[PDB]
Nucleic acid binder design. Structure first.
Ligand SMILES: [Mg+2]
Ligand SMILES: [Mg+2]
Ligand SMILES: [Mg+2]
Ligand SMILES: [Mg+2]
Ligand SMILES: [Mg+2]
Ligand SMILES: [Mg+2]
Ligand SMILES: [Mg+2]
Ligand SMILES: [Mg+2]
Ligand SMILES: [Mg+2]
Ligand SMILES: [Mg+2]
Ligand SMILES: [Mg+2]
Ligand SMILES: [Mg+2]
Ligand SMILES: [Mg+2]
Ligand SMILES: [Mg+2]
Ligand SMILES: [Mg+2]
Lengths: 51, 147, 210, 202, 102
RNA sequence: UCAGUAACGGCGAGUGAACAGGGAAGAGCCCAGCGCCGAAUCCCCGCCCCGCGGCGGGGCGCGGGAAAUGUGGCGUACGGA
RNA sequence: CCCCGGCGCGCCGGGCCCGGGUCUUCCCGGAGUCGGGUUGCUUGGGAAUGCAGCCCAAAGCGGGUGGUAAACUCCAUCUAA
């Protein structure tokens, strides 16, 4: 094994932004959060905002 | 991903995908582009025709920026200015003609391929083509030169 | 051995290239070293500009780039003499000076003079003796409102003069551009031999007289 | 005055200067190969090359045998491809002046070589004079115009090819003629051209 | 006429107003001074001439000028330097003539 | 980045830069020479007082040397006196 | 709580006796070096990119460079040893 193996990958900026918007649009769905395992059976509302 | 590669289904077969009769020896044809004239002539003639020989004059100290000339075609000439300049010249009535400066966009020569919209223009450019200038006269317009 | 169809590609790997391999694993560990020493420098020069001495406005050679403008190395001693700044005191108020530059044109010489004025007017000078002001020195009301400017000083921005839409005259429509280009190109490619053929027409037609 | 000795030492084909250079070359051909001179033979050329007539400055005269560099190998037998069968007509890549400056910089290793110059030659010898500085005197230590030579960076300038005669042999310089020494030296250019930059992200 | 600036032709180029300055003091180099000339000739009169300029002079006396130029060119190098050395080697010769003429 | 480019090469195998441009950094200078100055300069030893663990500062010595075969100051191609 | 150092301010004993602008008169440079021939190596550098050995051997409105050898004439560009 050598040290000039390709370790790092580069991604398109518009695709990192597509992935961020897709990872935020999926955090406001009770099913997609209760399926990741979180125990949110008593959260009053999913987009939980505080003062 | 090695787990997706082809050497993961090739465990247990003796020749590892490479032949029982003719083994996978090291260089059974020479290294690189060897035998371009002797035993790889059918390939260097069926796929790289004209690869062998000289032609033309040399140019020792070539500098790639004396011959700089990026061109723009007439079809996308009207794309250099904003939209409220072509429609402002449409709605215009005093015959005024917008000045499209091309060397300001980054092209030196203007080639004339596409159609033009019927309105006058003043094309500032460094070099013009005969047809590019005729398609501009035939619509009414001026071909300014800029050194 | 070549396959059916592909490129004749020459790989430049016939030297012992594994010995001289240069890996960039310290690129993130040197970007922080440069930034750290750049803020140690922006703290060593306290109110002086962080980018450094002001650079002149400068066209580029090489017709590929001779329409953009750039930031040169220093202000030619001609432009410093026009602006009235001693060449040995300019370097002490953050004005860059290289003597190698010539000034063939004027449209750039006056642009760099106007640039020196625009800098020697924005310049807040602190008095050599703190406890005692001097003659050519910004007053303490400025000095207390004198900050350290970030980024380049008086940054250089390519501008284009906005020309409004004229109406085309029949002298503009009379101008055959392509013919004028092919004519100037011919009259330039043939100027020497034409002048020699006419020197022969004038060296022969004189012999007839004598 | 100094420009009179200067314009005089350019008519080497004259009578007076071919008599002087010949009695000088004869007398030099009788002394040792490397001996200290009492005073600079050419005081003008010595000033031009940096010789202040003050304590610490030393002049060594040294003679070197002219001719190329025969290859040090057995009888013939340079085992290799016919390309490198050359032994006789080969040339050395460092001038005989740099070899004079480094036989002085090695015979007297305490002193620092500044420059050298030509004082005569014949068919079998070339005579140079090397301007050695004593870097631990106080006329050189205290005088700040020349206390650069006393720093450890300038050890063996001529073994590292930093004198004038040496720098003339490394083909360095700015221009379209000196492209193969862009960077530090010929090997620091060669390294960057023969070095594969492998970024993290390729 | 409607003449425009052109990138090509006999007067090509963007149009600027060419200023004037005192020429750089570098270009001044090489020119003789009224003192360096005096040193050059005052040492020409001490040394004399080279064993090949004693021959070029005798070749310019019999006026074999072509051979006297091929000799200087072969002996010193470039044709420009040979021509420029011959011009002075004939000016000195006219001096050694306008001298003993009276 | 130019660039696997211009070019080299049984013009085969293969070899192979530079200019420009965008960046990191950014800083200039000094002699000889030519002149001007009463050598206006430097090193060393003896003594005084201090400083004294990177051997210096100041004062004395009809103390010794180096140096006119050229020391120091101004001055170097952007001109300078 | 110990030590080092920097950045600081006073005081002493020293230095240093100083600049720019316009005129006027003056002065200004690095040789067995460049360069040419020839030989060997090296270079992408190809009628020689660079370097080196041997021979010839300079000039000063001169010299070098302007990527094809040479002559003529112009211009650009720096000022080597
Ligand atoms: Mg099988
Ligand atoms: Mg098998
Ligand atoms: Mg298979
Ligand atoms: Mg097979
Ligand atoms: Mg294989
Ligand atoms: Mg066959
Ligand atoms: Mg096959
Ligand atoms: Mg150095
Ligand atoms: Mg040389
Ligand atoms: Mg560049
Ligand atoms: Mg930067
Ligand atoms: Mg000095
Ligand atoms: Mg002096
Ligand atoms: Mg070898
Ligand atoms: Mg080779």
């Amino acid at each position: 094994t050598k040290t000039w193996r390709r370790w790092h990958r580069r991604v398109n900026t518009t695709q990192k932004r597509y992935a961020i918007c897709s990872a935020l649009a999926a955090s406001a769905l009770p099913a997609l959060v209760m399926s990741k395992g979180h125990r949110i059976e008593e959260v009053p509302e999913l987009p939980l905002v505080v003062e | 991903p090695s787990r997706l590669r082809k050497t993961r289904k090739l465990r247990g077969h003796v020749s590892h995908g490479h032949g029982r009769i003719g083994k996978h020896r090291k260089h059974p044809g020479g290294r690189g582009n060897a035998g371009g004239m002797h035993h790889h002539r059918i390939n260097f003639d069926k796929y790289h025709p004209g690869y062998f020989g000289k032609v033309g004059m040399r140019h020792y100290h070539l500098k790639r920026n004396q011959s700089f000339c990026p061109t723009v075609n007439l079809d996308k000439l009207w794309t250099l200015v904003s939209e409220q300049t072509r429609v402002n010249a449409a709605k215009n009535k005093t015959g005024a003609a917008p000045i499209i400066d091309v060397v300001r966009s980054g092209y030196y020569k203007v080639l004339g391929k596409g159609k033009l919209p019927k309105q006058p223009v003043i094309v500032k450019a460094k070099f013009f083509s005969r047809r590019a200038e005729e398609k501009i006269k035939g619509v009414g317009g001026a071909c300014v030169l800029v050194a | 051995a070549p396959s059916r169809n592909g490129m004749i590609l020459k790989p430049h790997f016939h030297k012992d290239w594994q010995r001289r391999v240069a890996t960039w694993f310290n690129q993130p560990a040197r970007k922080i070293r440069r930034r750290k020493a750049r803020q140690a420098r922006a703290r060593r020069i306290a109110p002086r500009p962080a980018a450094g001495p002001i650079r002149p406005i400068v066209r580029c050679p090489t017709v590929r780039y001779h329409t953009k403008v750039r930031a040169g190395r220093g202000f030619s001693l001609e432009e410093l003499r026009v602006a009235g700044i001693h060449k040995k005191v300019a370097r002490t108020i953050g004005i860059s000076v290289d003597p190698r530059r010539r000034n063939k044109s004027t449209e750039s010489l006056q642009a760099n003079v106007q640039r020196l004025k625009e800098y020697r007017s924005k310049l807040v000078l602190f008095p050599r003796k703190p406890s005692a002001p001097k003659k050519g020195d910004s007053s303490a009301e400025e000095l207390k409102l004198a900050t350290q400017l970030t980024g380049p000083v008086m940054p250089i921005r390519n501008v284009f003069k906005k020309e409004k839409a004229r109406v085309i005259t029949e002298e503009e429509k009379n101008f055959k551009a392509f013919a004028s280009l092919r004519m100037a190109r011919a009259n330039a490619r043939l100027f020497g031999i034409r002048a020699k053929r006419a020197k022969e027409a004038a060296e022969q037609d004189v012999e007839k007289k004598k | 005055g100094y420009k009179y000795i200067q314009e005089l030492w350019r008519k080497k084909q004259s009578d007076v200067m071919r008599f002087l250079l010949r009695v000088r070359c004869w007398q030099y051909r009788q002394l040792s190969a490397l001996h200290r001179a009492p005073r600079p033979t050419r005081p003008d050329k010595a000033r031009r090359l940096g010789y202040k007539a003050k304590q610490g400055y030393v002049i060594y005269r040294i003679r070197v045998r002219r001719g190329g560099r025969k290859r040090p190998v057995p009888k013939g037998a340079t085992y290799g491809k016919p390309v490198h069968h050359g032994v006789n007509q080969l040339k050395f890549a460092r001038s005989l002046q740099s070899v004079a400056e480094e036989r002085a910089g090695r015979h007297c290793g305490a002193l620092r070589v500044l420059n050298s110059y030509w004082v005569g030659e014949d068919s079998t010898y070339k005579f140079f004079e090397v301007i050695l500085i004593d870097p631990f005197h106080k006329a050189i230590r205290r005088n700040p115009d020349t206390q650069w030579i006393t720093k450890p960076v300038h050890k063996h300038r001529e073994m590292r090819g930093l004198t004038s005669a040496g720098r003339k042999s490394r083909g360095l310089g700015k221009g379209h003629k000196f492209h193969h020494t862009i960077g530090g030296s010929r090997r620091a250019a060669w390294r960057r051209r023969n070095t594969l930059q492998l970024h993290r992200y390729r | 006429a409607l003449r425009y600036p052109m990138a090509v032709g006999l007067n090509k180029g963007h149009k600027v107003t060419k200023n004037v300055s005192k020429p750089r003091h570098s270009r001044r180099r090489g020119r003789l001074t009224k003192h360096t000339k005096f040193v050059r000739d005052m040492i020409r009169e001490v040394c004399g001439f080279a064993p090949y300029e004693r021959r070029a002079m005798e070749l310019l006396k019999v006026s074999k000028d072509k051979r006297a130029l091929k000799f200087i060119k072969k002996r010193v190098g470039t044709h420009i330097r040979a021509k420029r050395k011959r011009e002075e080697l004939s000016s000195v010769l006219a001096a050694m003539r306008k001298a003993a003429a009276k």
